[PDB]
Symmetry: none
Subunit: 514 residues, 3 copies
């Protein structure tokens, strides 16, 4: 059923496939020669930890950039732009659709590994429902695997490579290289007829003892390229064979990129392939579509991709409220909120025409931040003059529907704290949520903006929306008001000071803009 | 199309599958210590030949017997009589049907290797139609691969056996046994997912270089268990798994045989499996059905069956004109004859009611010999006492429609010599054949039976139908046989009886029901 | 590669061409004066209908008569019998094999419009494999364009003639006659160099605004000559130039038909031309060989072939087991059947040697009916006396092989109703199609023949195969027809009592 998709894709794309054994074995032997395999063991030890940080990530990345200096099979950073040539106008619509579906699927699978999910003080059903997602995606009260300052540094660091695999099995398994090649050759042949299972690897193990090391019924989620998964072994086995149509052996180029995708959409239409609305393991169509859109120059499956920054939906653009798919990602990202924690909220613009919305939980250092186009532009210029200093031409790019979707998804029975309950009340009540209880702090003007300078020095990087000169009639310039910076400084006003805390965004950055 | 047929039978016969990996390696280890592999070489040399004689079969049977004596995994002579129990009445009706069609297909595929096909003086169409039968089945004027005294001695001698295969690759291929067990396992694993082919064997040889011994582009037809076919290698691989629903491991017993046949039928029913009415390689259903019905006790696929007598349709029977598939076997049987050669004919019983019919070709030595149930009980009795001495009770088990079908399939424009034409004329006539010219030679009473005693002395065993005491106007005389008349009327002409072993055109099973 | 074939044919057939720039306009003028273009717009309306019947075909055929009555460039009824002479015995065999291929292509493209294809309860893949087919040829469940009682009235009615195109562009486009000639000539000068496309005519229209009535897509299939296709304008623009060896201008005669055929087969041989076995539009080779073999008198491209009767393999014959080509015709003929509906089956003779075979679906009203040669005569000559009464000389001409070819082409899972089973079971099992379930209705022999004399009164003309006198053990009785048995047994279950052949009319007898 998932091997059927794979089979049809082999035939259709067989003309882009080739023998690569010599290039692979060369990289394996070069790793066997150059690489510090005790550091391979060190990175594996770090992947056994349930909780990992920046020191673990640096070690992984350093080992990644050590492998990358020794292999000749690498993918280069290449942007890709697609138009009506070769691909039909109908084909680019489908791609755009499937890519934004993929976007949702991959963000809901991988992001909670870094962003985290709240597993503390919740109802019995909610925990059961959160546990089911975290069982599925491979995963105080906030549980996460990667506690990092920059989660973008987790991109493309976890892919599996045939040559690295072949080298790792040879050194760590303590047998000759050829034995390993002749082992994955027999595995590679199982794969020409079925996706290999537990019993398959068992009986080969009797003739090739190496295949013990490999873990068969482990997931491909929350693993590195240094681990001995079923997928890494199967992939490495596909490249040792003498031909022919093995999908792993695809190379992409600017000259070949469109045709592969055109051929992918032909199979998809013939068999009814689709991007899953579920988080978890990638299906055959999800896997190929991501690996090709990741780079316009390289080998989608088997190359070195650790040099590549960004995602597949970013590295490839289509030139032509919230989607059900976006709604899902948003609803999963918000499970990061502790509903029992103290929560600030602030807005810029009048409550019935908001242009900036923020929420802030000071103890976890997690925040919601987003934007909206105004309706009353004639009133927007007034607030640009005297309050927020936002230019509307920079709000054009704000993703629509975000205002209602966040206020709808807010934890029920949460208590929101605000400097002036007035407008916040008329906002939540309007967006359908009267239930949310509100505190009024009621500070004075001098005491609310006491830590205004302190907050902008530490956190300026988190909002770039405020450009316009703001005045205060007596005219003289003042600091423009950010909705986010307001929240932080109002918490500091009450606290009596401001700590150094690395803030974590609840929303993905891909969601704020279009 | 047919790997599913296997995959489905695998799923339903699971409980009959088993672990024999050890017992095969044990039987190979015994062959490695006991078998003369130089004699294996000698038999393989005989299989490379086009024409094979009685001495080649003697060597082949002697070696098979030596293999047989050493292996612990053998099949036993166990006959099966099927009764309504585990199998429903319809299940049994389906079994009987298929065994008739299977009988036809396997006779048409195997028997011409011995019986032969005339390939001399014919129309271009007749030769192309015939040479296209030879490539379907993997095969003076007569073409044959086996020229033997008795073609029952060919039966069950050619099967493949994993332990023999295992033993032969080890000793002839000059590698250790352990590395042979390694190689076959990986092939056996592939066999779970697909039937391995050209490249599948090519790429496997790259780690295990014992596998270029095995021939890929060679069929299963016209080869012995000593040859390294893909099927023998694939078969042996199946045994290399401690588990897996492989049909090759199955054990049959008087207790389990019905239930096995029941399970096969469900798979056949479900998918729509069938016996193909075209000669050639066996389909998975034809294969399983044959091997199971040969012996009620033993291992259908993997045992030594070299000591088993009878074809599977004789060893297993159901208890509760010709069939379409009997006809195609009959038409295929007739191709042995030289249509241009000298050909005799003779009948016993009235031309309107023949009880015995025989045709004889004196040069190739081949004959048609069959019987028929009469209708004129009155005329029969006086003929019996004056001519053939055939007991009417011995004729009820004769195949009906055999007169029609044989006379039809006789080649157009043949020349028949006969003693007395009036009779032969009326029988060929009322059947569509006026095209055949008849030569009546003028042999008087005395001369036509000069070598009568000589013919019966030499050929008695060919006819057992004449038991009654025949008399002339009184004293006893020798009963008239259609076939013995044909031979002796030829003897009169030639001035001497020939000294040869005769070959039958008709499959022996086909004469009686 | 198809304009190559055009070009190459043009040079080799240069001397059977003339000019015709006078008579084309002459007949176009004789149309301007004496033809109502309201009925022409009425025809365009009818061809715009998604379903069409006998009354719409009447309005077409009468207009194909009225145009034929005025014009002096016409083809007339002329049969051709190809003998050796100019065409070597090797040319004849290549011409007989190609016309046979051509039969299979033209039938699979044009016939489904009338006969219909079932697009109801089927597997997605079937709905894929069958819609693919429709978009190639330009097309309850059964979808059809022409629903007519006589489908032979459809033949030679959709033809395209330049003069008819000329007179149509003039009156309907409201420009002067000359401006139509000026516009199409300029398109004809493009036809000497390449086959005009989307942009060719788009730029022509910039000087010739009258050329906007014309489509690039689509097509050249379920259109009539009253439409404005690309080809109609192209053919017209060819007959506007002086000389140049223009294919469209070819006139055939009983003295010249062999040499023109002799010419074609050289170019085919020299290039690699052949009759496509895939349905759709004609390649230039299919089109030339078809237009010529239609008639041996007139202008195969530009004449008034609207009163010509019978197809090109019928109107032209050669004088010296089914063919690969006919089996694909048969498989696309069995697509008409609704496999999810009440279906009968009946045969004559014994199951191991059937001489007449029938299947019938009442609700739609379609049937399968064919004959076979017997093998056993002793049994056939008795069945003739006491069951069917068919003469053996009538059974030689029946197409051999249809019996197994139809049975295998049956839909999988279909359920048959019969009277009785057993011998229907014996037949579908010899062929090895057990998957088919059988219902015996098992009526009494008197109850089976209640509506006997009624069915032979409404459907007699559908079978002319029963000649001999069938007797009962004696008195004369009405012979048994396998097809007439299908309809009467249906009536005995219905209590009461059109028909469309599933099998091609041309495939029953060879
Ligand atoms: Mn990175
Ligand atoms: Mn504010
Ligand atoms: Mn191995
Ligand atoms: Mn005699
Ligand atoms: Mn009937
Ligand atoms: Zn801001
Ligand atoms: Zn005898
Ligand atoms: Zn009839």
């Amino acid at each position: 059923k998932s091997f059927l998709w794979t089979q049809s894709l082999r035939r259709e794309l067989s003309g882009y496939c080739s023998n690569i054994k010599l290039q692979v074995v060369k990289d394996a032997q070069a790793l066997l020669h150059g690489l510090d395999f005790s550091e391979v063991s060190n990175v594996q030890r770090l992947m056994r930890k349930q909780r990992r940080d920046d020191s673990d990530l640096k070690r992984l990345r350093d080992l990644n950039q050590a492998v990358n200096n020794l292999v000749e099979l690498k993918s280069t950073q290449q942007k890709s732009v697609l138009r009506v040539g070769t691909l039909s106008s109908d084909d680019l619509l489908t791609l755009a659709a499937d890519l934004e579906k993929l976007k949702s699927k991959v963000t809901r699978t991988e992001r909670p590994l870094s962003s985290g999910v709240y597993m503390g003080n919740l109802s019995s059903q909610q925990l059961d429902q959160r546990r089911a997602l975290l069982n599925l995606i491979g995963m105080d009260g906030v549980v996460r695997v990667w506690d990092v300052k920059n989660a973008e540094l987790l991109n493309n660091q976890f892919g599996t490579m045939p040559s690295l695999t072949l080298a790792c099995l040879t050194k760590q398994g303590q047998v000759d290289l050829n034995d390993v090649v002749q082992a994955l050759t027999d595995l590679g042949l199982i794969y020409t007829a079925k996706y290999p299972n537990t019993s398959d690897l068992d009986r080969l193990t009797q003739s090739h003892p190496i295949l013990n090391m490999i873990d068969t019924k482990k997931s491909s989620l929350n693993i590195s390229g240094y681990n001995f998964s079923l997928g890494a072994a199967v992939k490495a086995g596909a490249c040792m064979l003498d031909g022919g149509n093995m999908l792993e052996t695809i190379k992409v180029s600017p000259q070949s990129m469109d045709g592969i995708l055109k051929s992918i959409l032909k199979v998809k239409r013939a068999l009814g392939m689709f991007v899953s609305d579920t988080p978890g393991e990638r299906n055959p169509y999800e896997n190929i579509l991501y690996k090709i859109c990741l780079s316009g120059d390289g080998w989608p499956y088997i190359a070195s991709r650790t040099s590549i920054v960004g995602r597949a939906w970013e590295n490839t653009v289509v030139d032509l409220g919230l989607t059900y798919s976006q709604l899902m990602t948003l609803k999963d990202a918000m499970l990061q909120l502790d509903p029992n924690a103290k929560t600030w909220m602030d807005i810029e613009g009048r409550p019935e025409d908001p242009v900036e919305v923020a929420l802030y939980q000071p103890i976890s250092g997690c925040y919601i931040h987003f934007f909206r186009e105004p309706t009353d532009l004639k009133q927007f210029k007034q607030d640009a003059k005297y309050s927020h200093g936002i230019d509307i031409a920079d709000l054009f790019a704000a993703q629509p529907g975000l205002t209602s979707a966040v206020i709808e998804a807010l934890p029920r029975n949460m208590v929101i704290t605000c400097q002036g309950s007035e407008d916040i009340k008329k906002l939540l009540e309007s967006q359908g949520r009267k239930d949310i209880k509100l505190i009024d702090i009621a500070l004075s003007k001098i005491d609310s903006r006491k830590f205004e300078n302190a907050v902008w020095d530490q956190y300026k990087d988190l909002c770039h929306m405020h450009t316009g000169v703001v005045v205060e009639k007596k005219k003289e310039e003042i600091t423009p008001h950010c909705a986010l910076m307001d929240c932080i400084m109002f918490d500091a006003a009450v606290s009596g000071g401001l700590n150094t805390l690395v803030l974590r965004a609840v929303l993905p950055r891909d969601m704020v803009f279009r």
